[PDB]
Symmetry: D3
């Protein structure tokens, strides 16, 4: 029983960690699609795919969880997008998404789609995180320590302020 | 330290497993670049990228090993291919390859490149394992049991036979 | 003589039918270009290239026109676009378009470009048709019965409402 | 019921014409996929997609049949190729092909795949027709008259001879 | 010593000329990256790469300057964009740009990056030029004569006005 | 009066130098298309586009010529190639090639095409030069000294011998 979720994870935060813990109550293994994999060094997408993969893996590695952090390019072709994801991932059974498009594409191919729970959405939000990194407000408590680590290694806050 | 190897892994086999254990005695973490990610459904590359990530993760999940199985697509552009691999992966320090083009691209970018030891190459080689699959000889002792399970799940031997 | 027209046809409607009837009075054959062929599943482009080819072909098949419905992707490259379109289509003599870009690229290559007559544009427009599909007003009498048929087969109205 | 065949058709010949008339006794409509769409001006692929559309449509306008001559690019990605073919084509139910790859991809997605009959393959062959066109032998009896006509209009034999 | 600058040059105006003469006081040769090289026939990007190379060349040829006008496509992948640029260009030692993204990408690759001086930026700006071309407000005394000559050969002002 | 020639220049050798001096007696300016611009680090294409631009510009800068060394990518689409080449380059009138595909593509668009003169074609050939580099014969006296110098900066012979 595998599940799939997809996000940009810029960065992976504590709401992601919670929803993955919840989904790991329902399914044996979780595929973690890293969308917009080619997008990096922008204000919405500050981090590369390999940065994201490192954040995610370093966050989840001591949990008793089988997961697959897989980079998925933006391709501009919605009608083949489910097959493109399938090409790159282990077979899976359930998709967790609240996004109208991801839900329509997967349901027309016969998959089950479920809406995940949101946890503390006024704080646990890439958009809100990046906004605090830019304005000097105190964001480290919003993501896993492993992500803090990574963001320091690559100087990601500095990157984001330079790009602004 | 982080190490880098790249192969097609069709399929991951006991010689890979051995070379990766040996690598891990040099370096803290290993990036496993899955090459020709887009090539599947052929006699030389039967399995999809996603099929390969499943095989590799199921084989290794086992060990006290931090590794990152990351699909890299054939791009036709040798001069930016180190950059492309660097976009998709955690920062790495040492490249294990005997392949002359991989070696030349990495060395010209300032990376140290080592040859890995071969283990038992007359059996442990994807070409030899695929040939055995096609003709109905035993191959399952040549890969980790977790690979045997995967190949059964995805009906990999039947695909090969049909393609032939 | 062969005329060329290009639109997105989401969906093909009675205006498109009339303007093609008008054009087949001037030229022996018509190439129907189906623009933005890779776009689908969006409120502006709900339907795939294949669904549009089916709509168009099922509308025009009883009419005794020779016509070629040909899918044309969005490429990002206006300077080569005429050549792209010429690669995919019979040789043609006249383009009918009132689009300033289509018009400019064809004229720079030496083609004759003519404006097509508009029929009943406050009703005969994909925008106004998708808008009624969405907001529940009747739209069936604005397209050919074959198009109503195809949209039923594929449940395109539900698709659109789910995407909104 | 819709059928699906795929070839390169350089050019469309009387073997195709007969394989299609035969298919048309099993199914209501037939999607003709024109494979290698972007390949032209070579000795194996002299003719552009649009030149093949014109040939195939002129040959068949003739008959009491509904067909869909649809250009399909060579994408280098076998895992997504059925989806890609599905994005560009009306829904179909049966695939006629003896090609071992096409047969696998379709069967893995649930489709029924049948071998078409061959007719007179030692003459009715693109390869043998191209050979005759280059060396000044009679080839006009091997294709529809509609084809010959197209070949004259685009000067295809002259092309092929200068390429050689 | 070799300097790099990048712009769209639609069109090269006197602001450009002066910033290049300045840079030439620091460096022996100047690579002029003509970016967005595939973008043309739009109100932001009116001219082709080949047109911009002929504007830029005709404007510098009688200065004592060694330069290299080299078209650079928009790729959608920031992370490998310095390697791409390096692929197409002679090796350079200093980058002049005040664009933050350009600056961040080249600084993470260890290059020295310097802001160029602005000259007369209310008149000497492509956006202002194209807006006068479009309004009938005047423009030729904002770019080199050579750029005027060119904009006349190709009829660029008419093009822009038809696109509007 | 501008002339166009296209080759891979790996590397630019004394036959290239002659044939371009010849062509410069017939035409006011020469566009040197550097084909296979993305191909590098192979035995047929050792050098990157920017490496070849450097070779070609070092070789000619002390002669009389007006020229434009412009990188052209291998696209895989013969029917649009002439338009792609036109996007990238100043307008040209005369094409010098003895290649049958280059010739056909351009004569089908109405261009005059002429065969250039061979000079010293047993020595003055990329193939022969690379072959000497790789088995140890002398090659310097076959290419201009400015090319020798470049091949030494970038250690071009070492790269080639490593790739073999
Ligand atoms: N009502 C009409 N009468 C004649 N020509 C029409 C009519 N409506 C559309 N066309 C046109 O057909 C082509 C564009 O079709 P397209 O499907 O994109 O049109 P639309 O109805 O305007 O769609 P949309 O509102 O979704 O943008 C152009 O030739 C345009 O002239
Ligand atoms: N706080 C949260 N609680 C539960 N799931 C969440 C939460 N935040 C995001 N997700 C899930 O993560 C995936 C979207 O990841 P994504 O990168 O878009 O996150 P985000 O927090 O919305 O960031 P952004 O503001 O940058 O868009 C979706 O599956 C969404 O369900
Ligand atoms: N038996 C082996 N022992 C050690 N390393 C191996 C062995 N087989 C392959 N490798 C290596 O793993 C990578 C090669 O991966 P790949 O799957 O492409 O090899 P392969 O088994 O030789 O495959 P194939 O026969 O399908 O080409 C390189 O690092 C090469 O060193
Ligand atoms: N003589 C024939 N009789 C029946 N079907 C044919 C014949 N030749 C080709 N086909 C069919 O057409 C399709 C392949 O078309 P394609 O254009 O590749 O034909 P071809 O004649 O084999 O060309 P080529 O020699 O140039 O490779 C397949 O479905 C194949 O069965
Ligand atoms: N007026 C100016 N004076 C000095 N430098 C300028 C001026 N305008 C632009 N630049 C510089 O030239 C390059 C920008 O070129 P680009 O074509 O993008 O410029 P632009 O004049 O801002 O055009 P546009 O408004 O269309 O975006 C950069 O190196 C930038 O520093
Ligand atoms: N010895 C030569 N004398 C004259 N022209 C030449 C000579 N060699 C090549 N050319 C010309 O240069 C262009 C071919 O460039 P290209 O770099 O492909 O040449 P090449 O020397 O044949 O290389 P290669 O062997 O690597 O294919 C053509 O326009 C051809 O006319
Ligand atoms: Mg979000
Ligand atoms: Mg191998
Ligand atoms: Mg419109
Ligand atoms: Mg064939
Ligand atoms: Mg600007
Ligand atoms: Mg040659």
């Amino acid at each position: 029983l595998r599940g799939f979720i997809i996000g940009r994870f810029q960065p992976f935060h504590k709401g992601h960690l919670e929803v993955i813990k919840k989904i790991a109550e329902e399914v044996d293994e979780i595929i973690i699609g890293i969308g917009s994999a080619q997008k990096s060094h922008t204000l919405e997408n500050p981090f590369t795919a390999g940065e994201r993969i490192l954040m995610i893996t370093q966050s989840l590695k001591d949990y008793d969880l089988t997961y697959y952090p897989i980079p998925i390019k933006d391709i501009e072709f919605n009608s083949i997008w489910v097959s493109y994801v399938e090409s790159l991932t282990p077979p899976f059974d359930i998709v967790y998404s609240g996004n109208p498009l991801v839900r329509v594409l997967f349901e027309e191919r016969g998959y089950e789609v479920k809406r995940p729970e949101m946890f503390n959405r006024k704080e646990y939000s890439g958009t809100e995180i990046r906004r605090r990194m830019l304005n000097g407000e105190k964001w480290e408590h919003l993501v896993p320590k492993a992500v803090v680590d990574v963001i320091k290694e690559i100087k990601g806050v500095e990157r984001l302020r330079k790009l602004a």
